[PDB]
Amino acid sequence: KVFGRCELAAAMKRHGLDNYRGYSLGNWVCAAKFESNFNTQATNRNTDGSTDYGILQINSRWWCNDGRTPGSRNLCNIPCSALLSSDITASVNCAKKIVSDGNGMNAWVAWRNRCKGTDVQAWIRGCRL
Ligand SMILES: [Cl-]
């Protein structure tokens, strides 16, 4: 499913991401726009052989199992296919583990390069939250 901007902001707020580890809701909406264009079914393969899955492009070397990433760790305890669901619960629960890992939202390259330090409140402007 391809979310609208405000529909996803509302879904993230309901699942407890607003201000999670100090990151306001606009940071999570901005990271989803540039990682996946708000599409839960987005996949992209990396040069190391790992693949990124879903709305927040969570990687199979560390976080989920896809059966084709040798020596990888499955820290979230989920098949990577669960991250492609229309229901974002598994992606949000695993994103909370990633953002707590020490480097905060700098784990998301698109957030560091396109959201960090910008007016991220713009991403939630106009929405009924
Ligand atoms: Cl980037």
Swiss-Prot record:
<dbReference type="GO" id="GO:0016231">
    <property type="term" value="F:beta-N-acetylglucosaminidase activity"/>
</dbReference>
<dbReference type="Pfam" id="PF00062">
    <property type="entry name" value="Lys"/>
</dbReference>
<dbReference type="GO" id="GO:0005615">
    <property type="term" value="C:extracellular space"/>
</dbReference>
<keyword id="KW-0964">Secreted</keyword>
<keyword id="KW-0081">Bacteriolytic enzyme</keyword>
<dbReference type="InterPro" id="IPR001916">
    <property type="entry name" value="Glyco_hydro_22"/>
</dbReference>
<dbReference type="InterPro" id="IPR023346">
    <property type="entry name" value="Lysozyme-like_dom_sf"/>
</dbReference>
<dbReference type="GO" id="GO:0050830">
    <property type="term" value="P:defense response to Gram-positive bacterium"/>
</dbReference>
<dbReference type="GO" id="GO:0050829">
    <property type="term" value="P:defense response to Gram-negative bacterium"/>
</dbReference>
<dbReference type="GO" id="GO:0005783">
    <property type="term" value="C:endoplasmic reticulum"/>
</dbReference>
<dbReference type="InterPro" id="IPR019799">
    <property type="entry name" value="Glyco_hydro_22_CS"/>
</dbReference>
<keyword id="KW-0020">Allergen</keyword>
<keyword id="KW-0326">Glycosidase</keyword>
<feature type="binding site">
    <location>
        <position position="101"/>
    </location>
    <ligand>
        <name>substrate</name>
    </ligand>
</feature>
<keyword id="KW-0378">Hydrolase</keyword>
<feature type="active site">
    <location>
        <position position="52"/>
    </location>
</feature>
<comment type="similarity">
    <text>Belongs to the glycosyl hydrolase 22 family.</text>
</comment>
<dbReference type="InterPro" id="IPR000974">
    <property type="entry name" value="Glyco_hydro_22_lys"/>
</dbReference>
<comment type="function">
    <text>Lysozymes have primarily a bacteriolytic function; those in tissues and body fluids are associated with the monocyte-macrophage system and enhance the activity of immunoagents. Has bacteriolytic activity against M.luteus.</text>
</comment>
<protein>
    <recommendedName>
        <fullName>Lysozyme C</fullName>
        <ecNumber>3.2.1.17</ecNumber>
    </recommendedName>
</protein>
<feature type="domain" description="C-type lysozyme">
    <location>
        <begin position="1"/>
        <end position="129"/>
    </location>
</feature>
<keyword id="KW-0732">Signal</keyword>
<dbReference type="GO" id="GO:0042742">
    <property type="term" value="P:defense response to bacterium"/>
</dbReference>
<keyword id="KW-1015">Disulfide bond</keyword>
<dbReference type="GO" id="GO:0042802">
    <property type="term" value="F:identical protein binding"/>
</dbReference>
<dbReference type="GO" id="GO:0016998">
    <property type="term" value="P:cell wall macromolecule catabolic process"/>
</dbReference>
<feature type="active site">
    <location>
        <position position="35"/>
    </location>
</feature>
<feature type="disulfide bond">
    <location>
        <begin position="6"/>
        <end position="127"/>
    </location>
</feature>
<dbReference type="GO" id="GO:0031640">
    <property type="term" value="P:killing of cells of another organism"/>
</dbReference>
<feature type="disulfide bond">
    <location>
        <begin position="64"/>
        <end position="80"/>
    </location>
</feature>
<comment type="subunit">
    <text>Monomer.</text>
</comment>
<feature type="disulfide bond">
    <location>
        <begin position="76"/>
        <end position="94"/>
    </location>
</feature>
<keyword id="KW-0929">Antimicrobial</keyword>
<dbReference type="GO" id="GO:0003796">
    <property type="term" value="F:lysozyme activity"/>
</dbReference>
<dbReference type="GO" id="GO:0005737">
    <property type="term" value="C:cytoplasm"/>
</dbReference>
<feature type="disulfide bond">
    <location>
        <begin position="30"/>
        <end position="115"/>
    </location>
</feature>
